[PDB]
């Protein structure tokens, strides 16, 4: 039993998924990957979406793991193939294989449109340092011709 979660583009429902059944109604990265892993290990499998729709997390007061990791520890599933981050808190209760994908926390922002140049941007092709210096040479030539 392979547990996973619907997340684009890891696991997505096909357009025609209503008339399909088994593992043929799911598509994505983790699907092809699961196919490959299953082919290397040589076992038949069944893709299942996690019940509570969460990832592994332990609640403080109850000490009960939810999500796919919870489905692994409590024997609700036999393997978890999903975009699951390898962490220490998760590694203590379950086993992680070597990373099949490397990532990191990044920043998503909206593309800003260029602000109006104004009086100080057309200057940029001739630097403020160069303006001061071209003025020093301006008054430095006019003093010699003087």
């Amino acid at each position: 039993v392979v547990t996973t979660i619907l997340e684009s583009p890891y696991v997505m429902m096909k357009k025609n998924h209503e008339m399909l059944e088994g593992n043929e109604r799911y598509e994505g990265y983790c699907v092809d990957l699961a196919a490959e892993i299953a082919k290397h290990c040589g076992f038949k499998y069944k893709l299942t979406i996690v019940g509570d729709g969460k990832y592994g997390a332990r609640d403080a007061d109850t000490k009960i793991w939810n999500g796919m990791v919870g489905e692994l520890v409590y024997g609700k599933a036999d393997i978890a193939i999903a975009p699951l981050t390898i962490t220490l808190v998760r590694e203590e209760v379950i086993d992680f294989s070597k990373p099949f994908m490397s990532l990191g926390i990044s920043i998503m922002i909206k593309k800003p449109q260029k602000s109006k140049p104004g009086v100080f941007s057309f200057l940029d092709p001739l630097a403020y340092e160069i303006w001061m210096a071209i003025v020093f040479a301006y008054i430095g030539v006019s003093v010699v011709l003087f």
Binding site: D95, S97, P99, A137
Partner: protein
């Protein structure tokens, strides 16, 4: 009349302003050709040093726990801000965070793992992007119950698929191949 000294001085000055204006035309032509824009938030320290641009993570997950358990000055300051921010800066889903970035009018910054960020960066109407390098180095892995018979084969399987370059090919398949904006009047 005509003076030789003033003539050659005027000449050297002429050549001078020539070099100057040619450089100006060149630099402006360059600015217009490439049209490189300075990053609005470049460093990850630019979010912590300013309170004007809001920034947040998911309401649950490894990212939020990364900011929770962080002893770093910048990241600890950022967590200190995010926990004290009103109205709520945390989102329930990734789609909610993205929708909050697009409907925020550029007032909200979404801290997310590089993978989904690279994915959404490839989705219409392509108004979002990833800025700066990654805050950390992690990875996704195939999980098995402790002491499972499947642990050893899945471990060997992942390495086998990775070394033969199938993981990179599959990633290209679901990220950049079907990507709407590829390869970056």
């Amino acid at each position: 009349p005509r003076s030789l000294s003033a003539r050659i001085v005027a000449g050297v000055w002429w050549f001078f302003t020539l070099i100057i204006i040619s450089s100006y035309t060149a630099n402006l032509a360059a600015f217009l050709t490439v049209e490189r824009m300075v990053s609005p938030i470049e460093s990850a320290e630019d979010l912590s040093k300013q309170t004007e641009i809001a920034y947040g993570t998911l309401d649950s997950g490894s990212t939020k726990e990364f900011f929770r358990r962080s002893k770093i000055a910048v990241f600890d300051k950022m967590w200190t801000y995010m926990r004290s921010a009103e109205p709520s800066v945390f989102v329930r889903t990734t789609a909610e965070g993205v929708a909050r970035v697009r409907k925020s009018k550029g007032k909200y910054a979404y801290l997310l793992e590089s993978t989904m960020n690279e994915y959404i960066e490839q989705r219409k109407p392509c108004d979002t992007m990833k800025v700066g390098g990654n805050l950390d180095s992690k990875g996704y892995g195939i999980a098995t119950p402790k002491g499972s018979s499947l642990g050893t084969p899945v471990n060997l399987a992942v390495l086998k698929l990775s070394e033969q370059g199938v993981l990179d090919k599959l990633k290209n398949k679901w990220w950049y191949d079907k990507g709407e904006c590829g390869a970056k009047k």
